[PDB]
Amino acid sequence: VDDDDKMLAAEAANRDHVTRCVAQTGGSPDLVAHTAALRLYLRVPHFLTEWTTDPDRRAAVSRALALDIVSMKLLDDLMDDDTGLDRVELACVCLRLHLRALHELESLARDPKAVTDILEQDAVHLCGGQIRTKRSRATNLREWRAHASTYGSTFLGRYGALAAACGGEGQPADSVREFAEAFAMTITMADDLTDYDRNGERDGNLAHLMRTGAVAGQDVVDLLEELRGRALAAVAAPPGAPGLVPVVHLYTDDVLVRLLPRHL
Amino acid sequence: DDDDKMLAAEAANRDHVTRCVAQTGGSPDLVAHTAALRLYLRVPHFLTEWTTDPDRRAAVSRALALDIVSMKLLDDLMDDDTGLDRVELACVCLRLHLRALHELESLARDPKAVTDILEQDAVHLCGGQIRTKRSRATNLREWRAHASTYGSTFLGRYGALAAACGGEGQPADSVREFAEAFAMTITMADDLTDYDRNGERDGNLAHLMRTGAVAGQDVVDLLEELRGRALAAVAAPPGAPGLVPVVHLYTDDVLVRLLPRHLGEAGAGAMATVKFKYKGEEKEVDISKIKKVWRVGKMISFTYDEGGGKTGRGAVSEKDAPKELLQMLEKQ
Structure with a gap:
């Protein structure tokens, strides 16, 4: 049973949870289907919990993160209002998943207070950030990175910290977060x-x-390489998560090989 | 001086x-919107009435205000008809909520009590709201059942948090029972x-x-029941007597100001009557047929309409005169 097998089982476990x-909280079939389709969001918690040594704790933190991440995704669907889904269901399910995650995460944290500490710390940066992003659209790579640094990086960075806070010992909290923030930016570009x-x-x-020329392909390539580098270094800090090395390359290379050509 | 504490509390919560x-990027309109949620901002003051330390009281009160408003913005977002910016609603909703979790947790006796409380009946609350919007109620029974989730459970949770964060001398079940009863009274008023x-x-x-699907008297009975439940909750030791006039204030407002707008010509249940023996007969007249009425010692003498230019006559002891009759006395 290799890492891919672990990952595949984690993703299915998160999806089912x-x-x-x-x-159970009233979600309609379209809404259930919608959440089951959030593949990467269901998968990402597995990467964030790679530093957790107890398999049982790891599976539990992983699914708790998946609940909140899906929750935040539904809240995002609710503000864009373009999925065709019922706004009442979206709102209610969003709230319900979130509250269950708070509960599950807190029951796994060394200090229950660490969960709300992390969620509040840069809540303003994250929420004020999303507002500004939708307010003034980016015109160059600098502005684009600045924005993605909030809804992408800060957003996953928080779950990074949560994973370290709920993962027991042997967790290099700052590195988990560095990893999450650099990886988040790679996938945000992919998206x-x-x-x-x-x-x-x-x-x-x-x-x-x-496509409109405001951004050069080489600069996008450069940013991707900088992000790859940042992620690789984060996972090499002791104790280390060597299992994430190929994952970093996989997602980075996919953007370079499959996605960029589509726009140049 | 409790009315003054109440106003200051609401103003402090408004400020916070x-x-x-x-601070999160909320536009002036959104700011004006939240400042206009007067009862939402004041209610936390009612929920923390049992808190003895004033500094803790003010701190719990504002944190509750934060999350209650947050939930209100979430509700505005699902209806999407305030004309407010959806991105701002969403992001501010989340920010306030996260801030409340932090403040509440810093005051709770136990680290897990906040998320325990929010999770315990999360399904009842969330699926409850879904069903409320999925199947519109068609009679008082159905109306009440729905109202018990988005109104009662909703506020009851904040009642439980107030007790969990309010230090010693908090009769948890009672603070919450008060919250659930008061929320329903407010929900009907709404x-x-x-x-x-x-x-x-x-x-x-x-x-x-207005449709006929629900009888005024039944609404009156429900209000009285709710008034009674709230009064019992605030009488539990150590007690929060200060909440008594607040309970009557809201219940009475619904009974005197709002109910009549949907009933019309005295929808006070059954038409009041006057019983008496006249000329050997057993008689009962509807207060509506009664013409004149005057007092003679402890007797109440009166006239009424029998049918046509016909005028009835009668007198009864004030001890047997219905309230309605006695009022016509003063009104005459």
Whole structure:
């Protein structure tokens, strides 16, 4: 049973925990299906908990993170209001998942207070950040990175910290977070470059800027390499999560090989 | 001087909430929106009435205000009809909520008590709201069952948190029982107000009333029951007697100001009567047929309409005169 097998089982475990929860609180089939389709969001908790040595604790933190991450995703669907889903269900399920995650995370934390500490610390940076992002669309790679640094980096960074706080000892908290923030930016770029065609996104979309000439391909390549480097270093800090090395390369290379050509 | 503490508390909560909304990038409109949530901002004052230390009281009160407002913004977001920016609503909703969790947890006796309370009946609350909007109520029974989740359970949770964060001398079950009863009274008032302020119809209690699906007397009975439940809760030792006039104030406002807008010609249940023996006969007349009425010692003498230009006559001991009759005495 290799790492991929662990990952695949973690992702399915997170998905089941999430859908069971959506269903029991009144979620409709379309809403349950919608959450089951948030693949990477369901997968990412597995990478964030790679430093956790007890398999049971790891599975429990992983699914708790998945509940809140899906929750935040639904809140995001609710503000964009473009999924066709019922706003009442979206709101209620969003709240319900979130509260269950708080409960599960706190029952796993060394200090229950650490969970709300982490969620509040940069709550202003994250929420004020999302507001500004949708307010003024980016016009160059500098502005794009600045924005993605909040809804992407700070957003996953928090779950990084939560994973270290709920993961017991042998957790280099700052590195887990560094990893999460650099990895989050790689995948946010990926999303941007996939959602241009799948969603028809334009304003502030990195793909659009690439096609309209406001952003050079080489600079995008450079940023990706800087992010890869940052992630690799984070996972090499002691105790170390060598299992994340190939994951960093996988997602980075996918953007370089599959996604960039689509826009140049 | 409790009315003054109440106003200062609401103003303090208003201050804390608005500054927090603005600090996160909330626009002036959104700030004005939250400052306008007067009862939401004041209610935390009612919930912390049992708190002996004033500094803790003020701290718990504002944290509750933070989350209650947050939930209100979440509600505005699901209806999406305030005209406010959805991104701001969402992000401010989250920020306030996270701030409340932090403040509440810093005051709780136990580290897990806050999330224990929010999770315990999270499903009842969340699925409850979903079902409320999925199947609009068609009679008082259904109306009450729905109202028990988004109103009672909703506020009851904040009652439990107030006790959990309010130090010693907090009769947990009672603070919460008060919250759940008071929330329902407020919820009915909301329905009977928003029928016209908002033009609400489906599942709306005022609409059900006007429609004939719900009887005024039943609404009156429910209000009295709720008044009674709230009064019992605040009488539990150590007690919060200060809440007594607050309970009557809201219940009475619904009974005197709002109910009549949806009933009309004395929808006070059954038409009051006057019983008496006249000319050997057994008679009962509807107060509505009664013409003149005057007092002679302890007897109440009166006239009424029998049918046509016909005028009835009668007198009864004031001890047997219905309230309605006695009022006509003063009104004449």
